[PDB]
């Protein structure tokens, strides 16, 4: 269904400028056990390395986090009242520290159990994309259920099941920009 590979993505630039803030992703992603590749490759797709972003609903800075909603999650967590400050999200350390964060919400909340963590890659860059809600019920109304299924597959499987079956366009192509940065970013390891 989705034609998600259309129009080419070049992630040549948005990857050159993400990885001047690669110290950072690598400290915020130990800090929250999150993959700094990731990390750098949602920076490349969301603000392409820029730390003044302004997004859909105002979700701001380096990863377009929306301060009342995804911010607030992570202040949540954290038992911090209230939710983050665009000024906050402009700054890239602090923003950084919560687009990690709120990716530890996701891959420790909705998606846990998922167990092959290149599956676990992609459901994570859905559900930031559109939120793991759409995704698992996709699968199935029940949480538990819908990972049981989504563990039956490998990843390129679960690329063609959010293609036919996701009802953002979003989802699938955030996949294929995924690869398309984590290919880039080859470039930049020697």
């Given at each position: 269904?989705?034609?998600?590979?259309?129009?080419?993505?070049?992630?040549?630039?948005?990857?050159?400028?993400?990885?001047?803030?690669?110290?950072?992703?690598?400290?915020?992603?130990?800090?929250?056990?999150?993959?700094?590749?990731?990390?750098?490759?949602?920076?490349?797709?969301?603000?392409?390395?820029?730390?003044?972003?302004?997004?859909?609903?105002?979700?701001?800075?380096?990863?377009?986090?929306?301060?009342?909603?995804s911010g607030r999650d992570?202040?949540?967590?954290?038992?911090?009242?209230?939710?983050?400050?665009?000024?906050?999200?402009?700054?890239?350390?602090?923003?950084?520290?919560?687009?990690?964060?709120?990716?530890?919400?996701?891959?420790?909340?909705?998606?846990?159990?998922?167990?092959?963590?290149?599956?676990?890659?992609?459901?994570?860059?859905?559900?930031?994309?559109?939120?793991?809600?759409?995704?698992?019920?996709?699968?199935?109304?029940?949480?538990?259920?819908?990972?049981?299924?989504?563990?039956?597959?490998?990843?390129?499987?679960?690329?063609?099941?959010?293609?036919?079956?996701?009802?953002?366009?979003?989802?699938?192509?955030?996949?294929?920009?995924?690869?398309?940065?984590?290919?880039?970013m080859l470039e930049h390891?020697?």
């Open positions: 269904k989705h034609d998600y590979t259309n129009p080419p993505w070049n992630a040549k630039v948005p990857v050159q400028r993400a990885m001047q803030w690669m110290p950072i992703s690598q400290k915020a992603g130990a800090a929250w056990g999150v993959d700094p590749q990731l990390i750098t490759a949602i920076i490349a797709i969301e603000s392409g390395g820029n730390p003044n972003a302004v997004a859909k609903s105002n979700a701001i800075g380096l990863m377009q986090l929306k301060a009342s909603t992570v202040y949540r967590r954290m038992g911090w009242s209230g939710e983050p400050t665009t000024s906050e999200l402009k700054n890239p350390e602090r923003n950084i520290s919560m687009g990690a964060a709120y990716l530890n919400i996701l891959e420790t909340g909705p998606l846990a159990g998922i167990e092959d963590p290149k599956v676990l890659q992609y459901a994570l860059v859905v559900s930031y994309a559109n939120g793991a809600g759409a995704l698992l019920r996709t699968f199935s109304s029940d949480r538990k259920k819908a990972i049981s299924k989504i563990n039956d597959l490998d990843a390129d499987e679960f690329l063609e099941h959010v293609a036919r079956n996701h009802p953002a366009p979003q989802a699938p192509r955030y996949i294929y920009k995924l690869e398309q940065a984590l290919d880039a390891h020697h």
